[PDB]
Amino acid sequence: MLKPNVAIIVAALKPALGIGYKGKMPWRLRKEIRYFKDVTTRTTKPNTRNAVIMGRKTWESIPQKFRPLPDRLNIILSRSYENEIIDDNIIHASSIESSLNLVSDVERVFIIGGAEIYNELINNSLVSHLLITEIEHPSPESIEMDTFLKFPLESWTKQPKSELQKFVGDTVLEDDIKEGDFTYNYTLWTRK
Numbered sequence: 001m002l003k004p005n006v007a008i009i010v011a012a013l014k015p016a017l018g019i020g021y022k023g024k025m026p027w028r029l030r031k032e033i034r035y036f037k038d039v040t041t042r043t044t045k046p047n048t049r050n051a052v053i054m055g056r057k058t059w060e061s062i063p064q065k066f067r068p069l070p071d072r073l074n075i076i077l078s079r080s081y082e083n084e085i086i087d088d089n090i091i092h093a094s095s096i097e098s099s100l101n102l103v104s105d106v107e108r109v110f111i112i113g114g115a116e117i118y119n120e121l122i123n124n125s126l127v128s129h130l131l132i133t134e135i136e137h138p139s140p141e142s143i144e145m146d147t148f149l150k151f152p153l154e155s156w157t158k159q160p161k162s163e164l165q166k167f168v169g170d171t172v173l174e175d176d177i178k179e180g181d182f183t184y185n186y187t188l189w190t191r192k
């Protein structure tokens with residue numbers, strides 16, 4: 001695959017864009033996890049699938065019985081890895097671009113995490129879209145967090161929901177989803 005458009009998909013707590021605490025998301029949003037699954041899995045073309053890209057630490061944090069993520073090509077980045085196809089669902093690579101050279105029959109590409117991946121790849125011009133779930137809570141400060149997005153959003157534009165809907169196709173987009181004390185919305189951003 002040559003110079004594909006890539007999307008980042010993340011869930012962040014406004015306004016600081018907190019994303020984790022000691023390796024874990026500080027919340028359990030059952031519907032939000034479902035949306036992550038549907039978006040990264042659905043495809044429109046026939047014999048295709050999407051690819052998910054993750055850092056080695058996130059891979060390692062998934063229980064072994066739960067990896068690879070089903071129905072998607074999993075790509076794991078490590079600075080120590082050789083570019084290699086492990087099996088039909090797993091690729092090892094040392095760069096995003098090198099990993100993409102090993103694939104065919106991929107419809108979309110998503111970077112899924114973690115923090116270091118997000119923060120480094122946001123500056124790669126292959127990244128064309130951001131799918132940010134913006135989470136809100138009455139007392140954001142009550143939530144312990146150590147990891148944050150460092151995204152240059154002054155250079156990105158938040159699109160209208162119509163554009164997101166077009167993006168995700170048939171997926172149902174509910175507004176102001178509430179779970180416990182959290183309220184969230186799905187958003188799409190593109191580069192200015």
Ligand SMILES: Nc1nc(N)c2c(Sc3ccc(N4CCOCC4)cc3)cccc2n1
Nearest residue numbers: 009010011020023024033036112113114115
């Ligand atoms: N919108 C969205 N985006 C993701 N990318 C999701 C992941 S994948 C993921 C992997 C790593 C991290 N983290 C960042 C740093 O370490 C805490 C874990 C967060 C999400 C798992 C569940 C729901 C998700 N929701």
